[PDB]
Amino acid sequence: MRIPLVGKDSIESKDIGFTLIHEHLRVFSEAVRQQWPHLYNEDEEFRNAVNEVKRAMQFGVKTIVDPTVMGLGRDIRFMEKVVKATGINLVAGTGIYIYIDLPFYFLNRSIDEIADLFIHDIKEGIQGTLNKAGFVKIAADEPGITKDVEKVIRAAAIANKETKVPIITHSNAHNNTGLEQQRILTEEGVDPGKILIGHLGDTDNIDYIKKIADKGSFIGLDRYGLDLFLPVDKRNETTLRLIKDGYSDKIMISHDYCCTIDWGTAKPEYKPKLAPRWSITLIFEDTIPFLKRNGVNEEVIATIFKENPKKFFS
């Protein structure tokens, strides 16, 4: 029913349980991995993914939603391997991760045939495997809403309307890209409560975060641990005021953690200073205790982690 799972039968939605809405098992650039496999260690990548997932499960995580898509090196056979090693509910997705331009394949190509690529993964299966896509992922950043970025957004809208699956975004918090995504999707007949505007926790600006929640979409305070974007205690006080002002029905939090990340901007040796305590369980060690002893009940955390994902996927 409703939500498709990797290496397991489809489950209902209400059966989602405690959910981490935004985590990565591994991300890489497709071109460079395909051309130079000597840069990578698949055993190290598998060992880290398994170890990180199992510890999340120990804290009571039932389901992880992994928005790794084209441009981030989505591998469904890798996803199966860790599912079997772990017993996690894994929700894979479809979509395109870009900041500026599409690959040359998409030259002179219609929004429609891009949407057909998403609708394919949702209905037929990812990479010819039978594991179906449960959501669609789109990105936007500092370069803003470009021609090719918009085409991916409008393609996501069509896939949403025709398969009823929700859409998760990557955005820049300081840009207005998050708001623009919401606007363009809604205009094309997308129910606001089916959109998660991501990386909104990268900013102090509660007013900007609020209006996106007011327009009716889930807000992504989803990069806990990544201190370079915003430190943990800055994020803690932002989520706290949002909960106090009654936005907990729109709040979704995660880590955006990568057990293995490809980019030279984020190699393991830069971890201290940039993101010293960044893991897939950081919110259990810091955020959740902090909120509990600051006057938030566990009905609120059940909203954010259980009820909100449930409404998102139905």
Choose between 1 and 32: whose C-beta lies nearer to a second copy: 32
The residue with its CB nearest to Fe ion is 256
Instruction: Identify the CA nearest to 159 among candidates 217, 74, 94.
Output: 94
Half-sphere exposure of 117 (CA within 13 A, CB side): 20
Count CB-CB contacts under 10 A for residue 239. 25
Helices 206-214 and 177-187, interaxial angle, to 10°?
10
Contacts of 90 (CB under 8 A, 6+ apart): 5, 6, 7, 8, 63, 64, 66, 79, 82, 83
| Contact partners, residue 164, CB within 8 Å, separation at least 6 | none
Nearer to a second copy, 24 or 62 (CB): 24
135 vs 68: CA distance, rounded Å: 11
Does 222 bind Fe ion (CB under 5 A)? Our answer is no
With CB under 8 A as the contact rule, which of the stretches 14-22, 48-56, 79-87, 258-266 interacts with a second copy?
Answer: 258-266
240 within 8 A of 246, measured Cβ to Cβ: no
Closest contact distance (angstroms) between CB of 27 and Co ion is 9
Do the beta carbons of residue 181 and residue 153 sit within 8 Å?
Answer: yes
Q: Using CA of residue 39, residue 43, residue 46, residue 51, what is the dihedral sign? A: negative
Q: Which of residues 250-309 bind Fe ion (CB under 5 A)?
A: 256
Which residues within the stretch 156-215 sit at the binding site for a second copy (CB under 8 A)? none
Q: Would you say 227 or 262 has its CB closer to a second copy?
A: 262
Of 9, 43, 128, 246, the one binding a second copy (CB under 8 A) is: 128
Q: Which residues in the chain belong to E strands, given as ranges?
A: 3-5, 8-11, 19-20, 63-65, 89-91, 94-96, 136-139, 167-170, 195-197, 218-221, 251-253
Q: Which residues are annotated as a binding site for Fe cation?
A: 22, 24, 137, 256
Report 65-84 residues binding a second copy (CB under 8 A): 69-71, 73-74
Q: Closest CB to Fe ion among 45 and 256?
A: 256
Which positions make up the binding site? 22, 24, 137, 170, 199, 256
Site for a second copy in 7-46 (CB under 8 A): 28-32, 34-38
- Cβ 272 to a second copy, closest distance in Å? 17
Nearest to 62 by CA among 92, 91, 27, 94: 91
Stretch of 230-238, 240-248, 260-268, 272-280 contacting a second copy, by CB under 8 A:
260-268
- Of the two residues 128 and 272, which places its CB atom closer to a second copy in the complex? 128
Residue count of the chain, please give it: 314
Of 84, 109, 271, 292, the residue at the interface with a second copy (CB under 8 A) is: 109
Looking from the CA of 165 toward its CB, the CA atoms found within 13 Å total 28
What string marks each residue from 154 to 173 as x (binds Co ion by CB under 5 A) or -?
----------------x---
Residues making contact with Fe ion (CB under 5 A): 256
Interacting residues with a second copy (CB under 8 A): 28-32, 34-38, 69-71, 73-74, 100-101, 103-109, 117, 120-121, 124, 127-128, 262-266
Residues in contact with Co ion by the rule CB under 5 A = 170
